[PDB]
Amino acid sequence: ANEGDVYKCELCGQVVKVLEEGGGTLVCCGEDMVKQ
Amino acid sequence: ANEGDVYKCELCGQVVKVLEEGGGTLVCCGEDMVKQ
């Protein structure tokens, strides 16, 4: 994901902002978080 | 996780901040992110 990017969990509605970018895929509730 | 909380992946260094709180556990590189 990228810096400044905002991700959401469609299962629980948790939302995060990417502060430091890295090559891993962000996961929550065992599903891929969705880029906003 | 809580609003304003910061999480990091110890494998790829990806750093996120929680904008909206949910009950799920944040995962990256298939591992639980660490609460900073």
Task: Answer whether residue B1 is part of any domain.
Answer: no
Query: Are B26 and A14 within 8 A, CB to CB?
Result: yes
Query: Are B14 and A1 within 8 A, CB to CB?
Result: yes
CATH number at residue B16: 2.20.28
Nearest CA among B24, B33, B8 for reference residue A19: B8
Task: Answer whether residue A21 is part of any domain.
Answer: yes
A-chain residue closest to B13, CA distance? A22
A17: region left, alpha or beta (phi > 0 left; psi from -120 to 50 alpha):
beta
What is the span of the domain harbouring residue B15? 6-35
Is B18 at the interface with chain A, CB within 8 A? yes
| Cα→Cα distances A26→A11, B31, B32, Å | 14, 10, 10
Task: Answer whether residue B24 is part of any domain.
Answer: yes
Note the resolution in Å, 1 decimal.
2.0
Is A19 at the interface with chain B, CB within 8 A? yes
